[PDB]
Amino acid sequence: KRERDQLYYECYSDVSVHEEMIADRVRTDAYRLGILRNWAALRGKTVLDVGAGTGILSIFCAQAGARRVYAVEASAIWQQAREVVRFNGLEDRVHVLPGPVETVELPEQVDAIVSEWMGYGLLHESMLSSVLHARTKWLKEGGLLLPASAELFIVPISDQMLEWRLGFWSQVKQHYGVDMSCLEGFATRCLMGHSEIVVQGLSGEDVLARPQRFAQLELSRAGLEQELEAGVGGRFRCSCYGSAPMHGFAIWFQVTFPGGEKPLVLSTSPFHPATHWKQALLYLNEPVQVEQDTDVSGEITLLPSRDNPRRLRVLLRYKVGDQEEKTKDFAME
Alpha-carbon gap, residue 130 to 133, rounded angstroms: 5
Is 116 an annotated catalytic residue?
yes
**Binders in 90-129 for ligand 5L6, by CB under 6 A:** 116-120, 124-125
Q: Choose one: 58-66, 123-131, 200-208, 318-326; the region binding Cl ion (CB under 5 A).
A: 318-326
User: What is the nearest approach in angstroms of Cl ion to the Cβ of residue 198?
Assistant: 14
Q: Enter the DSSP assignment of 123.
A: T
Q: Which residue is nearest to ligand SAH (CB)?
A: 51
The β-bridge partners of 199 are 280
Which one from 83, 125, 218, 299 is the annotated catalytic residue? 125
Q: Are strands 326-332 and 312-320 parallel, antiparallel or unpaired?
A: antiparallel
**Binders in 173-232 for ligand 5L6, by CB under 6 A:** none
Which one from 83, 116, 291, 333 is the annotated catalytic residue? 116
**Burial group, residue 191, by CB count within 10 angstroms (0-12, 13-18, 19+):** middle
**Binders in 113-172 for ligand SAH, by CB under 6 A:** 116, 127, 130
Angle at 141 between CA 136 and CA 142, to 5 degrees: 110
Q: Enter the DSSP assignment of 207.
A: B
Q: Are strands 196-200 and 326-332 parallel, antiparallel or unpaired?
A: parallel
Alpha-carbon gap, residue 62 to 137, rounded angstroms: 22
Q: Is residue 47 classed as helix, strand or coil in its secondary structure?
A: strand
Q: Which of 45, 82, 247, 313 binds Cl ion (CB under 5 A)?
A: 82
Q: Choose one: 134-142, 171-179, 203-211, 245-253; the region binding a second copy (CB under 8 A).
A: 171-179
**Binders in 44-83 for ligand SAH, by CB under 6 A:** 50-54, 56-57, 72-75, 77
Type of residue found at 327 = T
Q: Choose one: 45-53, 187-195, 266-274, 281-289; the region binding a second copy (CB under 8 A).
A: 187-195
Angle at 301 between CA 297 and CA 305, to 5 degrees: 145
Residues 6+ apart with CB under 8 A from 253: 118, 121, 122, 150, 151, 152, 153, 267, 268, 277
Q: Choosing among a second copy, ligand 5L6, Cl ion, none, which partner's interface includes residue 199 (Cβ < 5 to 8 Å by kind)?
A: none
> Is residue 286 annotated as involved in ligand binding?
no
Looking at the chain, how many residues does it have?
Answer: 333
User: What is the nearest approach in angstroms of Cl ion to the Cβ of residue 326?
Assistant: 5
Alpha-carbon gap, residue 202 to 231, rounded angstroms: 26
Q: Choosing among ligand SAH, Cl ion, ligand 5L6, none, which partner's interface includes residue 82 (Cβ < 5 to 8 Å by kind)?
A: Cl ion
Backbone angles phi, psi at 184, to 5 degrees: -65, -40
Is 20 an annotated catalytic residue?
no
Q: Which residues bind a second copy (CB under 8 A)?
A: 14-16, 19, 22-23, 25, 28-29, 32, 54, 56, 59-60, 63, 80, 83-84, 87-88, 165, 168, 172, 175-183, 186-187, 190-191
Q: Known binding site for S-adenosyl-L-methionine: residues?
A: 18, 27, 51, 73, 102
Which residues are known catalytic residues? 116, 125
